[PDB]
């Protein structure tokens, strides 16, 4: 969408990832599996709850005014009452429909941004030590055990630690 | 090491907080208030012209000339009419003022 990740360069979702909104799938010698990214999921849940709260909290239930009754010599004020009732109804009906449409578009873009930001954080870390193979996936030029995988999911990944390894494998296929 | 060029943004001593849709009480470097919440607690004179205070009288007593409204005789100009909630003098002789409310709206202009 607006950020090109969801239904973009990451074509589809992960039905097998049930414990979070965004995150990772890994595969190495120890094992594989989907794992939710806590930080992005936790913040996004707070944001959407705030967004829903900011729409409904001020929509407190109220006491509807009495339906007025008018006689045959009160058509003018009867029509004025009808104009008042119709005027308010049109505004709330039009605004509520339009507001939800606009909000829903931002909600999807918000999820799109969070995926893209999550992808960029990993890409900014690995650099030459991994190959971007599309669909939001990275192929390492070095062995990355379970401990190494969490460092990427942490913002801690040590590029020089695996640089000497990854450099040799990279230039091996480069030659 | 080598020469460095960084990219960054402004920060200051601002404790101003704004609310957003996804977050609340966000501290921002600059903001503009839109809401006035302060009053001087006094009835002032709009546009120079002083208001017409009816004292212990309602509009009926003033417009009729109740003896308790005695000071209200030099009435020449006013920005607005002030009525006290406890104004009880009005029509001292018991009776009904006909179209009293429309008279008040008429005098509002």
């Amino acid at each position, epitope marked *: 969408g607006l950020f090109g990740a969801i239904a973009g360069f990451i074509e589809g979702g992960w039905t097998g990832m049930v414990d979070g909104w965004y995150g990772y799938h890994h595969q190495n010698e120890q094992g594989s599996g989907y794992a939710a990214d806590l930080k992005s999921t*936790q913040n996004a*849940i*707070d944001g*959407i*709850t*705030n967004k*829903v*709260n900011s729409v*409904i*909290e001020k*929509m*407190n*239930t109220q006491f509807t005014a009495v339906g007025k009754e008018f006689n045959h010599l009160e058509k003018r004020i009867e029509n004025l009452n009808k104009k008042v009732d119709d005027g308010f109804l049109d505004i709330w009906t039009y605004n509520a429909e339009l507001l939800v449409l606009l909000e829903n578009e931002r909600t999807l873009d918000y999820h799109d941004s969070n995926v893209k930001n999550l992808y960029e954080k990993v890409r900014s870390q690995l650099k030459n030590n991994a190959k971007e193979i599309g669909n939001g996936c990275f192929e390492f030029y070095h062995k990355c055990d379970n401990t190494c995988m969490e460092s990427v999911k942490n913002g801690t990944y040590d590029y020089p630690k695996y640089s000497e390894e990854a450099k040799l494998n990279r230039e091996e296929i480069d030659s | 090491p080598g020469d460095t060029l960084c990219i960054g943004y402004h920060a200051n001593n601002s404790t101003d907080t704004v609310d957003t849709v996804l*977050e*609340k*009480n966000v501290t921002v470097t600059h903001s503009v208030n839109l809401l006035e919440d302060k009053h001087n607690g006094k009835l002032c004179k709009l546009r120079g012209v002083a208001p017409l205070h009816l004292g212990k009288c309602n509009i009926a007593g003033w417009i009729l000339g109740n003896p308790e409204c005695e000071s209200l005789s030099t009435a020449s100009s006013w920005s607005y009419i002030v009525e006290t909630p406890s104004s009880d003098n009005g029509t001292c002789y018991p009776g009904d003022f006909i179209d009293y409310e429309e008279l008040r709206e008429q005098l509002s202009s």
Partner: nanobody
Amino acid sequence: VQLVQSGAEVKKPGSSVKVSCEASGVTFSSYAVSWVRQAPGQGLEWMGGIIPIVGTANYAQKFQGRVTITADGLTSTVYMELSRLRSEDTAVYFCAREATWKGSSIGVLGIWGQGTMVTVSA
């Protein structure tokens, strides 16, 4: 805001108990709400929580299949229902809105209710 819980209750073992937890001046809210019980003289114990924006409820394993945390639509009232009570279920039960001055805060119990004493005895 102030969370107000239902009154203390007495129940015989094997029955079911439902506790309410309402907020003030809100009508409609989507804040997540957690329930925490406290056995006499012991520490706090997390039972579960509900996240209205995703429409699910998470529970601690020791209570799974026995407790339901529900909310009526988008209203602020949150209900906790415990089934098949035992003497070890006698405790003070707290509800807590997961919000701070920063807005909704999914993991921290910013505002707490007054508690609901439930005693199980036959």
